[PDB]
Amino acid sequence: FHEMREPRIEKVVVHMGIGHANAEDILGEITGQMPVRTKAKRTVGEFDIREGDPIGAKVTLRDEMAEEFLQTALPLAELATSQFDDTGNFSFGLDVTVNLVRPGYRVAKRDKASRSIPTKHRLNPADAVAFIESTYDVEV
RNA sequence: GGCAGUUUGACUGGGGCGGUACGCGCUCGAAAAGAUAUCGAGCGCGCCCUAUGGCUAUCUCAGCCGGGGACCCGG
Ligand SMILES: [Mg+2]
Ligand SMILES: [Mg+2]
Ligand SMILES: [Mg+2]
Ligand SMILES: [Sr+2]
């Protein structure tokens, strides 16, 4: 039964939402791969009189690049619980977001015959804390 | 304008003044095919755009919720 049910880390997105940068240089060092900039939709009084323009950057880490990061990133954070999404997700922090999910996820990310993951296969807050906690650190 | 010839439109609950229903577009009036009037009700057009056109690739939007009214992740 299990195995095809045990949690997995599908992507860790690290980003800095400045609102202006060379911050890409450091985000790339702490992660290992090339960052990408983020534009800002809608204009605002806080001098964002530009819609399509650099406001921040991010990096999406998957597989080893993600673990090699969390091993040296999680120690930096502290909190837990009441900091976890309903989808068994959690973000702390420069921000660090961890996306967790069960094995049959591709079914909702592929092009052909897509389908939205059943709420029964959907990860849970508790199932999340467990997995993480059960991997080099403590909860709440 | 000393003098000559003329013009100075139409619509309109008479005419004048006001206005334009004088060329166009939409809803309603309009009575479940089409057509349909009033100085009928609501309101527009006389442009603007070299991309705000065209095709292809990739992608999904308003709004709300949860996690770190800018940005990031998920629903
Ligand atoms: Mg005369
Ligand atoms: Mg004569
Ligand atoms: Mg008719
Ligand atoms: Sr006369």
UniProtKB/Swiss-Prot annotation:
Pfam families per record: Ribosomal_L5 (PF00281), Ribosomal_L5_C (PF00673)
Gene Ontology biological process terms, A to Z: translation
GO CC aspect terms: ribonucleoprotein complex; ribosome
Keyword RNA-binding included in the entry's annotation: yes
Transmembrane segments: none
GO molecular function terms listed in the Swiss-Prot or TrEMBL record: rRNA binding; structural constituent of ribosome; tRNA binding
Keyword Ribonucleoprotein: yes
Family matches, as HAMAP family: Ribosomal_uL5_A
Function: This is 1 of 5 proteins that mediates the attachment of the 5S rRNA onto the large ribosomal subunit, stabilizing the orientation of adjacent RNA domains. Forms part of the central protuberance. Modeling places the A and P site tRNAs in close proximity to this protein; the 5S rRNA and some of its associated proteins might help stabilize positioning of ribosome-bound tRNAs. In the 70S ribosome it is thought to contact protein S13 of the 30S subunit (bridge B1b), connecting the 2 subunits; this bridge is implicated in subunit movement.
Quaternary organization: Part of the 50S ribosomal subunit. Interacts with protein L18 and the 5S rRNA, and probably with tRNAs. Forms a bridge to the 30S subunit in the 70S ribosome.
Entry's family note: Belongs to the universal ribosomal protein uL5 family.
Protein name, per record: Large ribosomal subunit protein uL5
Organism: Haloarcula marismortui (strain ATCC 43049 / DSM 3752 / JCM 8966 / VKM B-1809) (Halobacterium marismortui)
Name of the gene: rpl5
